[PDB]
Ligand binder design. Sequence first.
Ligand SMILES: Nc1ccn([C@H]2CC[C@@H](COP(=O)(O)OP(=O)(O)OP(=O)(O)O)O2)c(=O)n1
Ligand SMILES: [Mg+2]
Ligand code: NA
Length: 346
Amino acid sequence: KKISQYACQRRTTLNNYNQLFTDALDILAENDELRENEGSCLAFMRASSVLKSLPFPITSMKDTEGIPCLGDKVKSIIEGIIEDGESSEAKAVLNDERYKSFKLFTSVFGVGLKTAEKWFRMGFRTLSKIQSDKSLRFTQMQKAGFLYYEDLVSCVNRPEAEAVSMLVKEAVVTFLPDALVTMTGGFRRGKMTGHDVDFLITSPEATEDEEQQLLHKVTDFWKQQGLLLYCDILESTFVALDHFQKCFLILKLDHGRVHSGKGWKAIRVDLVMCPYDRRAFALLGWTGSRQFERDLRRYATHERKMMLDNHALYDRTKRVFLEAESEEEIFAHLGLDYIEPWERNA
DNA sequence: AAAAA
DNA sequence: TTTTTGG
DNA sequence: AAAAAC
Ligand SMILES: Nc1ccn([C@H]2CC[C@@H](COP(=O)(O)OP(=O)(O)OP(=O)(O)O)O2)c(=O)n1
Ligand SMILES: [Mg+2]
Ligand code: NA
C-alpha cells in the first residue's frame, strides 16, 4: 500500500493523470540542469516521476499525503497549480532568455550544454544567426543537425519506427542470418512517438570478428543505396555510455516504406551490438526509461549491495557475477517483482 | 531538493 | 547535522 | 582533449 521512492518498485504506464503538475516539474528540473544545480534537478525529476505513476489526478493538498519525493519546495509548486491551474515558477523559467536560448540551441543534433552556453555568451539568440555566421566552426554532427533540422525536430511515429525496423532487420539478416534484432527504447515501452528508433542486435553463433564487422557491413550497404545521411560508429571497449559497439545514424526513410513534399524523412537511428550472453543486461539498459534505469542501479547499490550496468550484475558480498538469460532473471536476482516494459515509463 | 547515514 | 544522488 | 552521441 506504500508507494516506493524507487521507480523500479513502481508500475508507470503511459496514462498520466497529473500532466499539469509534471509538465511544470519537468521545466523546473530542466532549468536546474542548465544552472548546473544537479541536486535540485534530480529532486524535481524524481517528484515528476512519482506523480506519473499515480492512478488518479491530485485535486487537493491532502491528496499528496504519503507520496514520497514530495518535499516542501515541490508541495509549494503543487499548491500554486491547484490555486489557478498554472505554475508561476515554471512560467518565469519559460520567459527567461537564457532558458529559451538553451532549449533552442540544444534542439540541434550535435549541440549540448557547453556549445549552447558558448553561443549565448557570444550574443546569439536565433538558429538563423548561428547558421549564417561566417566565423563559427561547426562539427560534422552539427552540420547534419542543421541540414536535417526540421525532420529531426519532428517526432518519429509508430508507422515510421516499424518501417525503420524492417530496414534494420532486412540489412542485418543479409550478413548475419541468425541475428536477433530487438527494437528498444520508448517504442518497446509502448510509446507512440520518440526522438529516435533504437535497436539491440545480438547473434548466438557469430564470432568476435563477425560481431565487429556487422555494423560496418550494414552501414556500407545503406551508404551504397544513398540512405546513410550521417554515421558515427563507436567501436566496442567491452564511470557515461556503455562499451558495446554502437552507431548513431541518420537514415533516409522513403515515404513509400511507411504504411500510415520531398518524398522522404530523415530519421535518427541507434544500433547496439552485444555478445549473446550479455543480451539480457543490454536489453534492460536500452529499454529505459532514464529514471527507471537510474533507480534500478540505485536500488541495486543501496538496498542489495550489488552493482548493475548494461553489461553485467555483480554481487559485492558473494564476490560473484550473476548471470541472466532474460530480464525476468535480472529482476529476480535483485529481489524485485517483474515490471513489464510498458510499465517502465517512469 | 529530498531522504539516508 | 553531513552525505548522496546512475556512473 | 574537449564536446556530443545513449
Ligand atoms: N541518460 C540516459 C539516456 C538513455 N538511457 C537508456 C534508456 C533509453 C535508451 C534509449 O535512449 P533514448 O533514445 O534517449 O530513450 P527513449 O526512451 O527512447 O526516449 P524517446 O522515445 O524520446 O526517444 O537508453 C539511459 O539509461 N540513460
Ligand atoms: Mg530513443
Ligand atoms: Na542537441
